[PDB]
Ligand binder design. Structure first.
Ligand SMILES: *[C@@H]1O[C@H](CO)[C@@H](O[C@@H]2O[C@H](CO)[C@@H](O)[C@H](O)[C@H]2NC(C)=O)[C@H](O)[C@H]1NC(C)=O
Ligand SMILES: *[C@@H]1O[C@H](CO)[C@@H](O)[C@H](O)[C@H]1NC(C)=O
Lengths: 36, 100
């Protein structure tokens, strides 16, 4: 019933880990200065 | 504030300026860039290749192509079906199919 078909524990594990690159959210600053 | 003239990120890169005459605050977005990768079946089979423009939208690539802004001087012919948007980047020169 949940999009991505993760288990409750997998959903927990993904929600606990936080990604916070000092970039910009694109669909594809995130590219920095020649760094992709 | 009336005193600040431009701004910087947490990594001390510039991301905004104040226009010196209108005092409007403008954001500076880097111009699109990325790597280019070439998919080749091998020259002992075919000379057809596909080009992946990594990290960019196919719309941005098509606009840069039309405006003669894209840095490489070669062009890959677009058939409409040859242009497919992936998460990795824009893949030009390969027909996407549903069959896995
Ligand atoms: C000097 O700077 C001032 C503002 O810092 C300019 O004044 C504005 O100019 C725009 C031009 O489109 C007008 O629409 C605004 O109404 C002006 N502001 C005011 C308060 O009148 C001024 O034009 C600049 N000098 C020159 C020669 O351009
Ligand atoms: C590319 O940009 C268009 C709007 O210009 C947007 O609708 C589209 O979703 C973007 N690409 C991706 C992969 O999101």
């Amino acid at each position: 019933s949940k999009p991505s078909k993760r288990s409750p524990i997998e959903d927990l594990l993904f929600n606990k880990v936080t990604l916070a690159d000092a970039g910009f959210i694109k669909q594809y600053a995130q590219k920095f200065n020649g760094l992709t | 504030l009336p005193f600040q003239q431009f701004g910087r990120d947490i990594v001390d890169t510039t991301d905004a300026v104040r226009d010196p005459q209108t005092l409007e605050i403008l954001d500076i977005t880097p111009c699109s860039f990325g790597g280019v990768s070439v998919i080749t079946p091998g020259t002992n089979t075919s000379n057809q290749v596909a080009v992946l423009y990594q990290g960019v939208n196919c719309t941005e690539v098509s606009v840069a192509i039309h405006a003669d802004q894209l840095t490489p001087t070669w062009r890959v012919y677009s058939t409409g079906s040859n242009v497919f948007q992936t998460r990795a980047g824009c893949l030009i020169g390969a027909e996407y199919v549903n069959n896995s």
